[PDB]
Amino acid sequence: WEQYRDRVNMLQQERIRDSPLLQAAKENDLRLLKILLFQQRGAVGETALHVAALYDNLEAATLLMEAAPELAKEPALCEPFVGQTALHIAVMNQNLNLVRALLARGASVSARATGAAFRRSPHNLIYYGEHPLSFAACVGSEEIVRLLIEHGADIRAQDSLGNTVLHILILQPNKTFACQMYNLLLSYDEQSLELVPNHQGLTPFKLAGVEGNTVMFQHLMQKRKHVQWTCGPLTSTLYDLTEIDSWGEELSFLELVVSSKKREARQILEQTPVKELVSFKWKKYGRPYFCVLASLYILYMICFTTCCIYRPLKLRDDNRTDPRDITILQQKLLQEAYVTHQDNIRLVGELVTVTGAVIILLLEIPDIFRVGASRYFGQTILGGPFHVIIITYASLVLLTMVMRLTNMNGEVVPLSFALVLGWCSVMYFARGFQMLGPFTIMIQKMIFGDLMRFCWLMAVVILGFASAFHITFQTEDPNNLGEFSDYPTALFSTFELFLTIIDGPANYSVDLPFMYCITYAAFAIIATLLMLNLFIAMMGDTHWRVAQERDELWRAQVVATTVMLERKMPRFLWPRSGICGYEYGLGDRWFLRVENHH
Amino acid sequence: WEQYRDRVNMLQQERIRDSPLLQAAKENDLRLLKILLFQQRGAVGETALHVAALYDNLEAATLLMEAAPELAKEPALCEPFVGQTALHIAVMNQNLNLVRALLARGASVSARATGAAFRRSPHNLIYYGEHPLSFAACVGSEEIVRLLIEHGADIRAQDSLGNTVLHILILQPNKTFACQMYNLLLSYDEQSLELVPNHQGLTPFKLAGVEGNTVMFQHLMQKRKHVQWTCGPLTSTLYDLTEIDSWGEELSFLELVVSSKKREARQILEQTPVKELVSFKWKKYGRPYFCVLASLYILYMICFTTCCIYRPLKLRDDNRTDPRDITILQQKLLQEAYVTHQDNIRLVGELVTVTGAVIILLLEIPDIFRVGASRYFGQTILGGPFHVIIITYASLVLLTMVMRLTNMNGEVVPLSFALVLGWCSVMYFARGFQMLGPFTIMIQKMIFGDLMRFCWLMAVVILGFASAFHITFQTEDPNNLGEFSDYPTALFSTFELFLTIIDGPANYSVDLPFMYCITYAAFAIIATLLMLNLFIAMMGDTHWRVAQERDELWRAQVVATTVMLERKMPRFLWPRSGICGYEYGLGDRWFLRVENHH
Ligand SMILES: C[C@H](OC(=O)C[C@@H]1Sc2ccccc2NC1=O)c1nc2scc(-c3ccccc3)c2c(=O)[nH]1
Ligand SMILES: C[C@H](OC(=O)C[C@@H]1Sc2ccccc2NC1=O)c1nc2scc(-c3ccccc3)c2c(=O)[nH]1
């Protein structure tokens, strides 16, 4: 954890303090090293050249390298810093004379430094790989990368987690150094670099997509863009799509780019060469499958509710000689569901309900292991809080159907719950309407944004005031003042008086204790005037602030539902995307053109 | 008061008008003073050189100083202006030749001017101390402070209220003169200046903290910041903390900086060298003590409410031969609380309630005299309106427990009130939740921002309309139209009809007077359509305006609760902050490092 780097840094400062060699190296004097005139480690992995290269002392570097020739060719102890080449340390400080003298001594330019501070991790800040070439090409030393590649410093290589120098240069906050170094490393390759995967299994194109570097994405696209006729204003250009649509792999680029946990992947979809394709797909074959499947799901759910509304009956058997026993029906035995001939179609409806539940479970069971569990449960782009309520509705319908087949009493307790869950399951289908798009995404944001806070602050006030009212009314007879008879219905009545549905409990034939009157007068201005209206104002404030993000999230999830319902249906029905090129002689590469106007 | 300075200024203008000496001094002519050719006061403390230095007349200054040599070495009458050195007057106007000629005459450069217009007070505007060196170093005369310190003008000194020249230079709206003069006065010190307290008892570091001058705080910190290895992008720097964490004094710097009445002390906490420390403390040992103490307080309060819900009973003794007598229970004698064996644990619960009240009173009794009464009662950072309701709940539980032990009738009147107060006391514990943080601070701002105004304007309308309805319904029999029987329940029914809980009083078997109908139709559109909705809109407007301040206030109070629950618990459990330096040889100075990235 993070009480480790401080301790080893203080120990390293102790070890540079005590020994006069490294202390004079940090001092960079004249009559120190010659007056003294080696392979001893520091606190953890540091020789004499390391602190000299770290504090940029050229004369000390030259004096030590002409004193001991073998000392530059020496790695460090590897407990917090594996390898720790002096070249790799000095290239970050970027001294021309120092890197030239180090290559004159001829250090191992193909070294490897998989240190504990050298890893793609949220602990460290920099992620620079484990190579001096990667260090130079990510810092931006354009005059030094040529001297590094002069001695052939392994233009293709792996490291810890096995990515490459191009992925290192991509995964970086961009600048001019990034684009110039990308062009440089692409030129100095002389299939071998743009095609190599990693141990995460990604093409550099797809890794730039899953990160979100839009300018690197466009500068990689612009090397694969052939131009047709350009008549004045309008320009008809062409794009390649064999990277953007693999259609034979495990994870497509369009499917992977929507599934990241990073909150910048969604902005990649408004760039042209994926936006035109997804808008063509959504204008032709997105809606005329989604809407008809939604209509069939509407018909299935209304068939389920009109089948469940005809629940069978039996009259009462035991008497009700206690005045609060109103149970006028009961559920009869299993033998009489097939006795009446006006219920065979009702059993057919129960069969189609349980068949729909089984088929939706069998569809969604492989849909749980494609990308991660939190990638499928909480990503509002893919629709997590619709998936969980769909699978809960399916499992509860299965449980209540096997309870019906086992013929036990009290079946309505899963029935009403599964019925309201399956009917609110329709709200997933509000992605194919321009009106119904942002409103559901607003309510999905709004629940876990503020209704959680409002319920968490309402609960303590209501739990206080219900107990207060019950203490003040336990000395009161309940046959006239009906409310607050026992404690749970007092809790419920206070909840209702909070949300102002029920009227205030008042009988105008007798007198009421004044403590109730003063406490209810306090409760009115602490609940109904204040907190409900403040909740309304707070949700108006937060709607004013995140009205910007809803349309971007809606575009992200419509591209998500297009790629999901492209992957799901078999390829006998969905067309092959784009136009083929074998009838025009380019050869087995599908292509697309856009007609822009600059 | 403020009808004093005007009178003495008019008298001073009278005294410069009447005497031709000072009038020619203000005139600055040639053939006036030589044609006339002294120690007479003005209206209150003014000789001839004072008005000359005040109106910047160099030839008059030279002529008077070569006429009378002793006259420059002369203070003034001290009733509104004590001392009033001519050097101290002239240094504000900042004339080089005049200050050089005054030092050539050799005035008392170590003078002292504790005038009525010279004090740290909200009456005056400038607070410049009582020294010419302080005057020069706060004005910004960088070419004149050297000539002042040339004759050794007491680089360390006190004044009225006993602060120093460095505190004078700190307590000022900053500019370039301030930072350059701070560096100058630190250099010209040759433990003696950075360590001296005042008669308020503050180090200059702590006084700059309690004022709020962030740039002076950082320029004082930057003289105590040693730098470790700087490898390219990332930089590992070190801070000293023996000023920021005294841990042996009466008032720590972090404890004092949150307790000021100034509304700029809260912005100091987003500066790095205190922010990293308080975030480390809140991430390690802030929440895992606060949350478990909150859970134990939740358990104590729910034990209190489940003990109070089992209030003992006795049936009615006197009959109810009047139709509005519903009192079906009564509180029995003290002898039967220990009669039943199903109430010993209830008496145990009453004992733990009164023990919790006694222990919370014994904890909060020394917490009332640490910083001031209004510093502890109204500062929303420290939590005043939670402290007062906690101590009120404790005192009222003590009163109702001694009333139970004395066995008097009518005990529920403090019981319900203390119960609702102790249950709303949980709302203090919404500081350790990122969701529950700003919402409670919004409601605490909102009550005393606008609900006061809305209640103050609602009261007069409701007091009018209740009297109107009661006058119109005193000619009506109450056995059918139950509402508005007597005046207080008419007041309450109008309050309820304002806040729209109860429905409108209507019986559809008889007729009602038309004055009621027209007045209730006026009351509807003057209350429910208009004023409730306008209150909703006003609180939405003010939420839109002070949505900015809530997160800053929340950061301020989380640093406040960290320093308070660091000071409160004994030091056997809380760790010593930071890392020690004796095992690394620096010596008895705890230190901290930060890993920034520029
Ligand atoms: C929208 C959803 O409808 C419900 O209320 C249904 C049930 S009723 C319930 C009753 C007592 C205790 C927990 C319940 N929970 C339900 O889910 C809903 N809205 C909200 S807002 C804040 C919460 C919450 C989160 C964590 C713990 C306790 C409450 C919440 C919630 O749990 N559900
Ligand atoms: C939030 C608090 O709950 C209460 O109402 C409880 C009691 S009822 C009451 C009845 C008649 C007269 C005074 C009362 N006071 C209470 O405190 C609360 N909210 C507000 S808004 C404006 C005021 C206010 C301030 C100064 C004088 C009169 C009223 C106020 C208040 O005093 N208390």
Numbering used by the authors:
A (entry chain C), B (entry chain A): 29 to 65, 72 to 224, 230 to 637
Sentences from the paper on this structure:
In the cell, binding of PI(4,5)P2 is critical for channel opening while rapid desensitization occurs via binding of calmodulin (CaM) to the base of the pore. The intracellular portion of the protein is primarily composed of tightly packed ankyrin repeat domains (ARDs).
In order to verify that the newly identified TRPV5 inhibitors, ZINC9155420 and ZINC17988990, bind to TRPV5, we utilized cryo-electron microscopy (cryo-EM) to solve the structure of rabbit TRPV5 in the presence of each compound. We were able to resolve nanodisc-reconstituted TRPV5 in the presence of 10 µM ZINC9155420 or ZINC17988990 to 4.3 Å and 3.8 Å, respectively. While severely limited by resolution, the ZINC9155420-bound TRPV5 structure was still able to give us some insights on the interactions between this novel nonspecific inhibitor and the TRPV5 channel. In the ZINC9155420-bound TRPV5 structure, the density attributed to bound inhibitor is located at the interface between the S4-S5 linker of one monomer and the S6 helix of an adjacent monomer. Two additional densities appear to bracket the compound and, given their characteristic elongated shapes and their presence in previously reported TRPV5 cryo-EM structures, they have been assigned to lipid molecules which may be involved in compound binding. This mutation resulted in a right shift of the inhibition curve (IC50 = 9.08 ± 1.45 μM) which suggests that M491 on the S4-S5 linker is involved in ZINC9155420 binding and inhibition. Unlike the ZINC17988990-bound TRPV5 structure, the S1-S4 bundle appears to be occupied by a lipid as seen in other TRPV channel structures. Rather, in both inhibitor-bound structures, this econazole pocket appears to be occupied by a tightly bound lipid molecule.
